Scaffold this motif. Structure first.
Motif: not given
Ligand code: CL
Ligand code: CL
Ligand code: CL
Ligand code: CL
Ligand code: CL
Ligand code: CL
Ligand code: CL
Ligand code: CL
Ligand code: NA
Ligand code: RU
Ligand code: RU
Ligand code: RU
Ligand code: RU
Ligand code: RU
Ligand code: RU
Ligand code: RU
Ligand code: RU
Length: 129
Positions: A64-67, A72-77, A86-103
């Protein structure tokens, strides 16, 4: 927002995590417990200058980007602040990318050290799912 155990299990299932990349729902609940104590607003600064954000403590070096994380990168955009909602959508979506990354879930060190190989189904026990 500080989720209840079963409330987050339910939310995580709603958002697509129930066996995502083969990790059962209790693995995700366990990882959120030890990363954030189920607090979506959790933030923690790392030694490398990066910061971890949200329920699953997703880091600004890669995801993610925090400036304020040089090189750094911002692979979850997404701004890292999205991960605190309060809405976990962005965390969950990004988590799906992380858990897909190889490890897989070893990407979360607290999951490897505190959840991996344990009876993670305990974390969803009792919950109406
Ligand atoms: Cl929803
Ligand atoms: Cl499951
Ligand atoms: Cl489980
Ligand atoms: Cl940055
Ligand atoms: Cl941004
Ligand atoms: Cl949600
Ligand atoms: Cl895996
Ligand atoms: Cl159990
Ligand atoms: Na970043
Ligand atoms: Ru399931
Ligand atoms: Ru299920
Ligand atoms: Ru971390
Ligand atoms: Ru990668
Ligand atoms: Ru990578
Ligand atoms: Ru059991
Ligand atoms: Ru359900
Ligand atoms: Ru059901």
């Amino acid at each position: 927002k500080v989720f209840g155990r079963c409330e987050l299990a339910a939310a995580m299932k709603r958002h697509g995590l129930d066996n995502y990349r083969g990790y059962s729902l209790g693995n995700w609940v366990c990882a959120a417990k030890f990363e954030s104590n189920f607090n979506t607003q959790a933030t923690n600064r790392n030694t490398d200058g990066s910061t971890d954000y949200g329920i699953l403590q997703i880091n600004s070096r890669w995801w993610c980007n925090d400036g304020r994380t040089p090189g750094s990168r911002n692979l979850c955009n997404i701004p890292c602040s999205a991960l605190l909602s309060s809405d976990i959508t962005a965390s969950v979506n990004c988590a799906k990318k992380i858990v897909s990354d190889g490890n897989g879930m070893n990407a979360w060190v607290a999951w490897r050290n505190r959840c991996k190989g344990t009876d993670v189904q305990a974390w969803i026990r009792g919950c109406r799912l």
